[PDB]
Every structure is written in structure tokens, then in C-alpha cells.
UniProtKB/Swiss-Prot annotation:
Family annotation (PANTHER family): ALDEHYDE REDUCTASE II (AFU_ORTHOLOGUE AFUA_1G11360) (PTHR10366:SF562), NAD DEPENDENT EPIMERASE/DEHYDRATASE (PTHR10366)
Species annotation: Sporidiobolus salmonicolor (Yeast-like fungus)
Protein name per the record: Aldehyde reductase 2
Signal peptide: none
pH effects: Optimum pH is 5.5.
SUBUNIT field: Monomer.
Gene Ontology molecular function terms on file: alcohol dehydrogenase (NADP+) activity
Keyword Nuclease listed: no
Amino acid sequence: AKIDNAVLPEGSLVLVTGANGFVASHVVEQLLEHGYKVRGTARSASKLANLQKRWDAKYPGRFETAVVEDMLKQGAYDEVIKGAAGVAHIASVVSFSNKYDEVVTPAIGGTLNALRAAAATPSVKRFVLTSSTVSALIPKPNVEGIYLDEKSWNLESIDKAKTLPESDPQKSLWVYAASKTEAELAAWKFMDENKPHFTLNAVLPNYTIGTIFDPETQSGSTSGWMMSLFNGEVSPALALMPPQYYVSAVDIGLLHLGCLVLPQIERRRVYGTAGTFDWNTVLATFRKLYPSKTFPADFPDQGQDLSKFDTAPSLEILKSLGRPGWRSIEESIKDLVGSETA
């Protein structure tokens, strides 16, 4: 069909863990759009009601809500993974509670739990793990000589996370970074040690910008934070986020799709890094999209991201799916906040 030589047959069922999440909902949307059936998990059926409603109207009988309230529980995926040909693990831990052992352990645990379920389920042929650019690094404004490729690991986050004082403005970020880094490493180690019968790929998005399908419960996401600024809310938590790379929610969905069905994509770490930005380029875009609206004035210069990412597999995927190149930051932000029109 739309995708020639897709490793997963048309109409195949794909299990998407944590389908009510912001990023996950776009992965789900792209899969459904491409004719694949999806069974999305959430800690409760109610957390997926609004999205279920949306998908029932748009893709009649293609999406199914599945409940998994304890992603760490042994055998938690025994029933939901049944009949799945593909798996996109996007479910995340439940906290910003600093204790390294309390944040990192569950992260690794949830990842391996889903990986073992897939290894035990013969129907599963492809597995895509939603990681993050923090598994490679924490952004470093104005620093030259940074090039991230598939062999780049945020090794410094491990120590930084367990040594930095709680007074450090970024300790919370470092703990999160360590959790993502350790989890992805554990995922690749499991592939290397158990040699399961499925292909693994990982998508590493940076700052995802796009339409918030369900604002009711998705306002804490990256786009949720951006929408907050659009509404005039300025907070230290926001300014604490440095200049880095954005990526369209649409492209992130496409990248996951590619990792799930493209034959030429195997054992890759796919960077979701379209271009750089800072809060001032974001405000500039807001002003252009809504010329009559009042917005906060520019933030003090926060520097710029001078790093570069090896997006080879990413671009390969986008081209193969017929959506070459990254969607621009202006169109991405327009997806999120719309524009002054009538």
C-alpha cells in the first residue's frame, strides 16, 4: 500500500504503551492514518476517553483502549500484547521525585518489562522505544564542537544526577536525563544479550511542538509548556529550559512509523531534531502568527544551540514515507497555537 515493503503487513495491530501521552497520541494518530490498528494503553480507561472519542470519529474501529495501571507489574502486558505485530513503548514513569534510585529504577524497569513481553510474544516483529535527546546530552548554550551521532551517550548525567546538590537548578533535569540514558542502554543491552526475535529502533525527540489533541490532560507536555507562554505565562521553570532543538509532533509520529515498518531501518537511534530555537524565536513566531495579540517581551539573551545531530536515519525515514524534510518551526507552532485568521 502507501508503504512498499513494509515489514509489518497492512492493517497490522500495533501496541502503543502510554497512548494518552502527548507524543504517544501523535504516534497513534500517524499509525491510524496509515491504516494500522492500534491498542493503546493508559493507567485508566478514563485517561484515554477523550482521545478514544476523537479516534472513533476519525478512524472508526481502528483504535482500542487497553488498561495497564502498573507498567512495572510482572505480566502487565500479557493480555494487551496478544496479536501485536509491532510495539511502540512510550509509557513513562509517574514522577519528578528526585531520588535517583526512585526515578532511574522505574525507568529501566518499565522499559525492560515491555521488552521482555515482546520477546515472549512471537507475533511481535518490530519494537520502537521512545527515548530522548537527553540520552545523548543536556543542551549546552554557546558551546562549540558538539556533534551527536548514534554512539553519543549522556554518561555525565549518571554522576551529575547522584552527586549534584538539590540546589542546582538542573538537578531534576539531570535525574530525568540519567533515567532516560540508563533505560535506553538497558534496552540495547537486552537486545545484545537475549537476541529476541524482533528488531529494535529508538526515536530520540528533542522539544516536540504540535497540536495538543486533548488539552485536558496533555498540558504538561513540551507543547503544553509552550502553549503556557503563548497565553502569557512566564515562569522560572520555563526560562530554566535552554536553547535546543525543536521537532514537529507530526514528524515524530512519522519517525516512529518508520522505525516500525521500514525494512532499511534497524538498530538505529533516530534523532528528532529538526532545527534550533530559543524562547525568543518562539515569541517572534507567536507575534507573526497573531499580530494583534499581546505577548511577553523577549527574554534576556540565553545564547543559542551550536550542536549538530546525525539525522541521517531520520531524513531517510521521512523521505521514504513521502514526507521529506522537517516541518518548519513556524508551521509546527501554528499546529499548536493556530493563527490569527477567519
